[PDB]
Amino acid sequence: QPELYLLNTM
Amino acid sequence: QPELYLLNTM
Amino acid sequence: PPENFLEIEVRNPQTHGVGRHMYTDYEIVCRTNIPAFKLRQSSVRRRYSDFEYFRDILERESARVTIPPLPGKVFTNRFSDEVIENRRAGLEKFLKIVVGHPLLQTGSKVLAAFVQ
Amino acid sequence: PPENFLEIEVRNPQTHGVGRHMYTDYEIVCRTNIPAFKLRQSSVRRRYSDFEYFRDILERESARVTIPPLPGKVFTNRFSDEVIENRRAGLEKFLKIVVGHPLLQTGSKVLAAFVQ
Amino acid sequence: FSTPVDIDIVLADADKRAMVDVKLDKNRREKVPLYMDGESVKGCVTVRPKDGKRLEHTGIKVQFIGTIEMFFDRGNHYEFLSLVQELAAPGELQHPQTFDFNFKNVEKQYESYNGINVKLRYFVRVTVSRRMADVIREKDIWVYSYRIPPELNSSIKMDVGIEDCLHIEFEYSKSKYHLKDVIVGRIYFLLVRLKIKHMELSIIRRETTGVAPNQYNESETLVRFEIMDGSPSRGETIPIRLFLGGFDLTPTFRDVNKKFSTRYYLSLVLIDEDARRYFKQSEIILYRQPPE
Amino acid sequence: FSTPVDIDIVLADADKRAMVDVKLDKNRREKVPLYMDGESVKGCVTVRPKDGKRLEHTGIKVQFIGTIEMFFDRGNHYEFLSLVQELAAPGELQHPQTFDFNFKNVEKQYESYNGINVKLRYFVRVTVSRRMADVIREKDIWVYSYRIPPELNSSIKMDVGIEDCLHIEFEYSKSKYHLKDVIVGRIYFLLVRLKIKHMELSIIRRETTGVAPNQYNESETLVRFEIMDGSPSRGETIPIRLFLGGFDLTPTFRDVNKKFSTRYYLSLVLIDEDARRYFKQSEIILYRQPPE
Amino acid sequence: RLLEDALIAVRQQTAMMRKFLDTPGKLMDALKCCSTLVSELRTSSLSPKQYYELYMAVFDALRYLSAHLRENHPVNHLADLYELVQYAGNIIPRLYLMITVGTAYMSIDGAPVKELMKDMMDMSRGVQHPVRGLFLRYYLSGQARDYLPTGDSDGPEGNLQDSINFILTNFVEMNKLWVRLQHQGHSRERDLRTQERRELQLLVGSNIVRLSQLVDLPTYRDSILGPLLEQIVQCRDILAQEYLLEVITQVFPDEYHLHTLDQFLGAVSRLNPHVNVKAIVIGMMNRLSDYAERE
Amino acid sequence: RLLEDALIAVRQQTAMMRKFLDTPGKLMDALKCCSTLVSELRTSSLSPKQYYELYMAVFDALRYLSAHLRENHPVNHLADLYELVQYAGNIIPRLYLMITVGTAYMSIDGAPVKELMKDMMDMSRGVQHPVRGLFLRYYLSGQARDYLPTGDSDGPEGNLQDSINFILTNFVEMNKLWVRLQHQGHSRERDLRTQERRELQLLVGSNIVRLSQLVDLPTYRDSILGPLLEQIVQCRDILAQEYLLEVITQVFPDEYHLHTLDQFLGAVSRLNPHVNVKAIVIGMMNRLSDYAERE
């Protein structure tokens, strides 16, 4: 239902 | 066969 | 304009023909400053089966999210005034939801092409 | 006499009677210094059924040890010379074993009465 | 009638020994004596007869048990410690009797835990053996596992983001925190091209049960702690101060008897205006500090 | 083929640790490492694969076991100590692997014993679990039980006899003797009215197995030691010096785990000329002395 | 509807907080009721006047809380209470509580006052929502009003620089928020936003008044007007320029201005013609004319 | 025959014993065979002459074994051999082995002389048969009568007094055995027993010979003849009194006897009327007659 986006290392 | 007699306290 | 905005409407229905191939189309008027659009004001014409085709393309491009269904096919009186208005209001509401969705605004190429 | 000793023998058979109640008896001669006997030399007469009765009394008094059986009853010729000797020799051997047994010498009252 | 016999267990240090709590299903709190690894367990088994009859038995014993129970399944219980003291031989009981017991310097390698798919508990079990049905009394205890300040504790510092949209550096002061310690940290914004409504820091507990492809992970979100209200710009620094003592957590337990892990994660979450949710999870080791 | 895998156990102190002997059935002598109560047991489980195949398993463990075995009956074995170390989880083996193990400060309450109706033995048991048939390796050890010089050791002194026939006073210097100690004693004749051919002093070992009316007593006459040849008179004193180190005895074991007793008796025997045998039995406690 | 219902809930929570405040060891329960009360501040549908009035009701309850803490420390304590109060789930209650506990700490122990201000000042970097952050920082200014380390200090560690830093940093952050009021919210509410800025201007000018009950003329020249002129010349805003300059002129004395006349005139030279510089200049020049005619 | 069967067994055992004595590490086998041989001496069915002959044959073989041991200890050792010989199942072999090892130890080990000699003499008190124990004491005498704790000791264990004590104690035990010879077997073989005793008189008198290689006249008075006279007068037998008194007189010096003449006559007065006092007195007077005729 609510979008969940993993934050990637730079 | 061979008799066995207990020795009593006095 | 610091803010990002999009305004859209489906209005001005028109019915065209000489006999065979009679149809109606609707004007889509859009104003935006979103970075995926190429001009500030777009005005285009689309008929109901253009909206149907756009939906299949949008659902396939998305590979992902929930797209509401369209108001529906009509077999009874497609060229009646009330029927045209019922459909126009449903297309107007449908289009405002689709173009208002943040991920479609920034990611959908198909959306930009339908509007422009 | 520092040592304790007992010597015994069954000998001198004699057959007595006028007719009815005919019987034979044997002399038991014993010499001893054992503390359970009352005289140094004993000489007594005993018939075979006295030995039989003595054995039952001895086995019952013992409540305990192995007493050899007597040479046996005779139905064929009890007053024959060979039969009297066969029995006398068997009584002589039996009596020497019974009176020679250390526990019977110091503990048997019945034994002392049979000899004296 | 009733029971012919009742079994009670009274510890030798029962007055002066500290007790501790345990949370159990439906918010229940039980309270049992506290023990540590290496401590001797000693006391009296007190048998109270109740009837003027006689109790025939095939032996009385007391056991110190430490066990791991999985999925509430009785066939999947594993004893990792069992010590026995035989208290009476086969015989009768007609009248009350007490029996002394001492378990010398008892090893207690793990801390007690009650979870979803796992129990780890320690108890004294008295068994009066009978011809068709034993009289059994269990007597639960808690074991704690203590650890000194760690030799290596480094700060957690990471640059993370969504390309050309959001770039952030987050810093947490330690990788290893005690149960009443404080998450001191900060969030530094390097690039913001998304519209951020708020940001919160969450502590997540994962219980991992099983062996190899048999793996069940239960996940419970213990805290949601807001650390920013409103939209930041680049160069902004948001402070974090989150006190762990407000949420009553267990230590980090790693591969206990090769049967379960209980692990703790800081999950940083940022939420946009359209309710899209951007996150980064980082493990933290929790440990029970020893008081002096 | 052969076995796909062979299990060997190598102790960490294997070079420097003392070993001891045990007498077993048909005069056999086995030799195993010596241990004491409180010592840690530690080493390596060494797995030697033998085939170029693969060994699928549902876990590998090592156990320290101490157990009492009665009448050679497998249903009548009683473990009084069991400690487990899990060495591998479910998986495969394709190539040789060693696994470290440490059992910390292992309690070992009893001394090892091999008797007629009783065994008491301690061992390391490695188990590689498999789908229908485990690979099991046992590895026996000896445990000794040590005791200091006893606080109370009184002499055994007794007047005994047969009334008006034989009266004697016997004296033995201690009630408690170590395994290499000396029975120093004497026999004093107060009344002699029987003819005595000779006198001997015998050490008798009784092994008592069972519980309550279930009692089996095995009796073995370890030594017959002549102390007098010929007839004494009253006032005569016969000396006894009997060295226990010539007969290799076990300590006195009393009610071990409430399952067996191993007890030692001095039985003094006098024989008359007609071969009648007059005796007096007296218990003596044997104990394993600790060297410095 | 929402404002009065919220004020009812506020009065209920003040009653429960005070009944808890009566009992020592109900302080955490009192803080829970205070947080529940400040939860009323989570509505944003109240008008600026309505949100302000709700703030006043929560502020009044906070006055009870701040006196209660400033009494708890004088009677026993609660250790690490400043940290412990940061566990509160609601952020606006939590930060208002942070100011309340902070001021209680300044009252109980003067030695950490300087250190506590650096911590409290740093943590005020959170709330950047203009209305909520301005009201929070107003609460901070009223709570932290009387404790500043300076030559006019109260006996905490600290010199004229610590107060100058506290007030200038507080000025810059609130002014940034006050201008952001111009921006925050939605674009068709520009006049409402200008109303909100005029409402919150006193919050900014309290810092200038606090500065004038602070460091003197050389410190004014070096370390007050300089920062102030940097902001005045760099805002290019109109409402802030007229307000902030008139507040500077009125609040600090003209003996001070006389020592900063050239700094003033170098500000006077950059006036941007499309910025409503004419109104600012006429009011300043008229003031200087009036200054002249106090003859 | 019994004697010959035993002597056959002795020669068989001597043959394997010597083959074992030849081979190192077969010494224990030689001792086991020696125990089997000495078991023949455990019989009591031999005639006095036959038992003497069996003892002499076994004694010479024991001398071969004893020399082998008394050489092995002087060249390397055999550890715990004194203990090891106490392992033997048959008691008469066992005690003969302890005497053999005792004397080997006495040759090798000077320090344990008193304790080992005292031990061997005390534990030889176990022999419950007069004849076998007497023959055993000859094995002892051949082994160790020459090694006694004596004047040969120069400060460690042993002194001439210890040897005097050892021999006096040996006299008392041999005398008790000597009277006990009178009482072993049946009472009607009294003349045969006295014949056997006459045969064994040398066994008692070898001790007197050993005594005459020893201490002087005051030591004779206090600690030899004194003791000897109480025993001589209280033993109350005839063969021992006549033999032992004549052996004492010849074997001990008459210079000593002169100093003790009155002690002798007071012993002569201390005898049974029922012992053959006439023979003893006539023999004493005859000896004094010799004390008169040797011109």
Numbering used by the authors:
A (entry chain U), B (entry chain V): 551 to 560
C (entry chain G), D (entry chain L): 71 to 186
E (entry chain F), F (entry chain J): 5 to 296
G (entry chain C), H (entry chain A): 12 to 306
Quoted passage from the original study:
Retromer is a master regulator of cargo retrieval from endosomes, which is critical for many cellular processes including signaling, immunity, neuroprotection, and virus infection. The core of retromer is a trimer comprising vacuolar protein sorting (VPS) proteins VPS35, VPS26, and VPS29. Here, we elucidate the structural basis of membrane tubulation and coupled cargo recognition by metazoan and fungal retromer coats assembled with the non–Bin1/Amphiphysin/Rvs (BAR) sorting nexin SNX3 using cryo–electron tomography.
SNX3/Grd19 contains no BAR domain, consisting only of a phox homology (PX) domain that selectively binds phosphatidylinositol 3-phosphate [PI(3)P]. Comparison of the assemblies demonstrated that metazoan and fungal coats are essentially identical, and hereafter, we describe metazoan retromer:SNX3 unless stated otherwise. Arches were arranged in a pseudohelical lattice wound around membrane tubules. The fungal retromer:Grd19 lattice shows less regularity than either the metazoan retromer:SNX3 or the previously described fungal retromer:SNX-BAR lattice. For both metazoan and fungal retromer:SNX3 coat reconstitutions, we included membrane-attached cargo peptides that contain a canonical Øx(L/M) sorting motif (where Ø is an aromatic amino acid and x is any residue). In the structure presented here, SNX3 binds the core trimer at the interface between VPS26 and VPS35. It is oriented with the PI(3)P-binding pocket facing the membrane and with a clear density for the PI(3)P head group present in the pocket. In the case of retromer:PX coats, membrane bending will be enhanced through a similar local membrane remodeling by the curved subcomplex of a VPS26 homodimer and two SNX3 proteins, while further membrane remodeling derives from insertion of loops from VPS26 and SNX3 into the head group layer of the membrane.
